[PDB]
Amino acid sequence: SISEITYSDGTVIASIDYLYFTTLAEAQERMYDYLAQRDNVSAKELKNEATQKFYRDLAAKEIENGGYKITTTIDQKIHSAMQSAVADYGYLLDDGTGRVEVGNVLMDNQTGAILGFVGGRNYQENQNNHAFDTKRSPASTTKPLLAYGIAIDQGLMGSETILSNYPTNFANGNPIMYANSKGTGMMTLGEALNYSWNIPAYWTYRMLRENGVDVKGYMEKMGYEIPEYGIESLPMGGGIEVTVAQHTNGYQTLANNGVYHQKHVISKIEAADGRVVYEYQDKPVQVYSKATATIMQGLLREVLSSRVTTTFKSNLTSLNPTLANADWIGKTGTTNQDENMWLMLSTPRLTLGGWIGHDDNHSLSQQAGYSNNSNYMAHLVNAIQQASPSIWGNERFALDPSVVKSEVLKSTGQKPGKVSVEGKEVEVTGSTVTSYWANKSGAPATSYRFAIGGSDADYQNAWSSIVGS
Ligand SMILES: *C(=O)[C@@H](NC(=O)/C(=N\OC)c1csc(N)n1)[C@@H]1N=C(C(=O)O)C(=C)CS1
Incomplete structure (x- = not known):
């Protein structure tokens, strides 16, 4: 008998096109974890690098001979509907600057499970996985977890507190910029998010730093690795590089009323004789107060309503008014010289993260994030929708009692x-x-x-x- 990977219903994906290599890589990695523990009682030589190789390799072979049953989180029908969406609409991302790549991950706000993803426009023509391995800065989508989420959460501010967006300079002497602006006097937390002004974010982190809030504690609890928290532009997504998968997980947290569930693609590994080699442990963690999280979902619902930095809600309404009615929340990001765009969405029951960009780091059109990526995500959103009518849900996000x-x-x-x-x-x-x-x-x-x-x-x-x- 031979080894196999299955959809969460039970259907066999392949025996042992991104679909195959993702579930296999995460499979091998849980396998490695178990081998290293399966006696060979290791720690710390786990750090030596000759070992790593040996095991990673040993891992791979255990799946090839060994004959186990790997149960993924993938909902076949949605995953297929997603692949189809990218085949049928990927082209709306192209904007006179050559093939634009794309990575999306659709995650249950409550399990943390990944129901499906988009790896890139076309596995045949190009194989990097933009959902799983590529890393870019999340930009102005860092704002809600690293600056505002945190401060509200330490009661250092609330829903309509007020931030200077008056001109001011980094410590080098250079102006903090927004697109082309030097600033504009005072504004609400509401305005600052709806437009993604940079200065407010800059002052927020700074104040956090002066009360020395353990910022890192928070980010670390969601799975983020940031090598240096002492950067003035940190909140704007300076010095942070992430994967769509991982960061989707950050929006999963705000969405599930402040409760992080750890991202994953594999739920169960079971040996020939039925013995359970790996199974997903549900450990939830309360990263933000339900007060903070629900407050935030309110503000992030006007980020899309406002339509200031994304045409999305308009796009979606046009392709399907009923669905455009779900309680959507989200945030955008754009990096220096238009080199990447991000759009995160959640309804209370699912999260969708989406990054578009070029592999070689060059520039998109100015419109790419505001228009293209929005309309494409709206089409993807329908597509999942059509495939699994109930999935996105009808619930409201709601302000908690506390x-x-x-x-x-x-x-x-x-x-x-x-x-x-x-x-x-x-x-x-x-x-x-x-x-x-x-x-x-x-x-x-x-x-x-x-x-x-x-x-x-x-x-x-x-x-x-x-x-x-
Ligand atoms: C947020 O992402 C912010 N963008 C920037 O600060 C910088 N790019 O400007 C062209 C930037 C941030 S991190 C990095 N390496 N460069 C604003 N975000 C949006 C948005 O899409 O919400 C904008 C409309 C433009 S600037």
Whole structure:
């Protein structure tokens, strides 16, 4: 008898086109883990590199002879529908800059299982796996996990707090840029995400760094490896390289109300005589407070509604209005010189991550992320849809009970009151808004320095203008 890989229903993929090599590689890696433990009681010589080889190789052979049954997470019909979508629509990513590659991973928000993926436009013509092995910076999609998610979560801010987007410079003396802008004064957390302004993200991380929040603790809990957290542009996705698979897993976390389940493609390995060599252990972990996570899903639902940096919701509506009705949330990213684009989507029941780019690191059109990648993802989204009607779901994302609402002046994210404006102390009034907070006591009173970030010059022109009462 010979070894085999099966779809999650039970259908045999192949015996022992990305489909084959992904499930086989993850298969071998769990095999390696088990061999290294299966006695050969190792640790640390596991670090020596001559061994690694020996085992990796030994691993491969155990699958070739050995005769085991490998159970994947893959839902055949969706996976096929996905391959078809890329065959039928990959071409909408092409934008006068040569074949554009693509990597997507569709992940259950609750198991962490991967129901299917897109490896690239065409395994025959080119084999790198853009869903699994390639790594690029996630850009402005880092913002929600590494800056805002965290700070809200340490109650250092809430839903309508306020960030300086006034001009300001890295420590080298160069201007923090957004596309072509030097900045624009103050704005809500809402605006800053809907447009992905860079400066607000820059001030957020900086403040985290001054309270020394254990940022790394958080990122590490989702599976991220970032070699150096002391980079000023970190939050914008500077110094971070990731895979679609892995980062899809980051959006899975915000989506499953702050609870990370570890990504995977393999659920079970079973030996000839039925003995279980590997089985997926469900260990959940609570990376963000349900307060924080649900707050975030609210804001990330306007990121798509707003349509400011993605045409998606329009594209999807046009190809299928019912579905465009599911409670979608998401975020985009663009890297320097338009070299990559990212779009992450979740409804509460699934996540879809999608990266488009060139293999050799050159540039896409300006539109590629905002338009192309959006319309393509909307077609992929239908395609899964058609293949498995119930899959995406109808549930709403919802603000958790533990969230805490506050009345605050639109003008300063903060509860109204007296403040010190250079002699002449001030009664601070204007219209209010409810602002969500993931701490026990809600918003502060207004303070001269209400916003995250801002210079002295800044606050002066800001409070100046707030003064027309
Ligand atoms: C977010 O990704 C931010 N982009 C950038 O800061 C930089 N690129 O600008 C052309 C960048 C970030 S990391 C890196 N290596 N380069 C804004 N993101 C979007 C978006 O798609 O949401 C934009 C509309 C353009 S800039």
